[PDB]
Amino acid sequence: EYPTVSEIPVGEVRLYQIADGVWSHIATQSFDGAVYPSNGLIVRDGDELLLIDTAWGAKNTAALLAEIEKQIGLPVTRAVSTHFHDDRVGGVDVLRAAGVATYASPSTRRLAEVEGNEIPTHSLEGLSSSGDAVRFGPVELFYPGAAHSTDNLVVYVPSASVLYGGCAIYELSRTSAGNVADADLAEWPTSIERIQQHYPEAQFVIPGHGLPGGLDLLKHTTNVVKAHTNR
Numbered sequence: 001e002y003p004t005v006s007e008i009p010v011g012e013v014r015l016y017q018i019a020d021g022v023w024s025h026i027a028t029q030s031f032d033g034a035v036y037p038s039n040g041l042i043v044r045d046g047d048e049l050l051l052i053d054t055a056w057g058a059k060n061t062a063a064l065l066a067e068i069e070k071q072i073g074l075p076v077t078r079a080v081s082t083h084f085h086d087d088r089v090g091g092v093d094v095l096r097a098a099g100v101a102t103y104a105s106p107s108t109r110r111l112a113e114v115e116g117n118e119i120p121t122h123s124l125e126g127l128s129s130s131g132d133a134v135r136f137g138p139v140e141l142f143y144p145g146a147a148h149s150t151d152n153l154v155v156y157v158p159s160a161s162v163l164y165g166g167c168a169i170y171e172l173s174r175t176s177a178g179n180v181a182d183a184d185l186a187e188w189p190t191s192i193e194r195i196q197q198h199y200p201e202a203q204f205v206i207p208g209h210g211l212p213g214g215l216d217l218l219k220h221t222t223n224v225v226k227a228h229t230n231r
């Protein structure tokens, strides 16, 4: 029942309700002749919504906002991008234009800038050291250490025990490393272990791309990362 690529045309965005007040948003993008899914999150915060990550580009992100207004009908007042790649910040200018306050760690902002990507307006403090956590509205933000990228954040929704790993976490069907040009292969397994230590009670784990599962996705990612390491 969780949507896959074949069900989502590029341009279109799906919402999937995970818990009371918790959805993922799912979009697709075609790159080098293949089509990829990508996840983000939506958390209700009173009469407003917190958005985690864009839907990978301006077009998809504009469709995400229309889809949220149509299906949920509460305003997106804030957005956090969990790292500096285009699937996380591509569409930030659309959010900003719609009056959404956009946020990211200083480190994510600097890396976006260097990459020439869109740049969240606000800087998130308290997340500079591995193991650091801060509360941001209805979620906890966690910096596990470098993994898929040096800046990657993970997000936890304590009310629903939902752990959103972003692109630091692989789905189960993904058995080979994705793009790791910006990865810290050496630290990645250690960073995943910090996630496991901090959220042992997580009941749903969302990867940046593909199908959700349970905490097994953490060991799965380490397995893939270590395999790639020994290539």
Ligand SMILES: O=C(O)/C(S)=C/c1c(Cl)ccc(Cl)c1Cl
Pocket: 085, 086, 087, 167, 178, 179, 180, 181, 182, 208, 209
């Ligand atoms: O494997 C992943 O989760 C991602 S984010 C791959 C990637 C990278 Cl490394 C750079 C740029 C872009 Cl656009 C993408 Cl999609």
Ligand SMILES: [Zn+2]
Pocket: 083, 085, 148, 149, 167
């Ligand atoms: Zn990435």
Ligand SMILES: [Zn+2]
Pocket: 085, 087, 167, 208, 209
């Ligand atoms: Zn990604």
Ligand SMILES: [Zn+2]
Pocket: 172, 219, 220, 221, 223
């Ligand atoms: Zn596995």
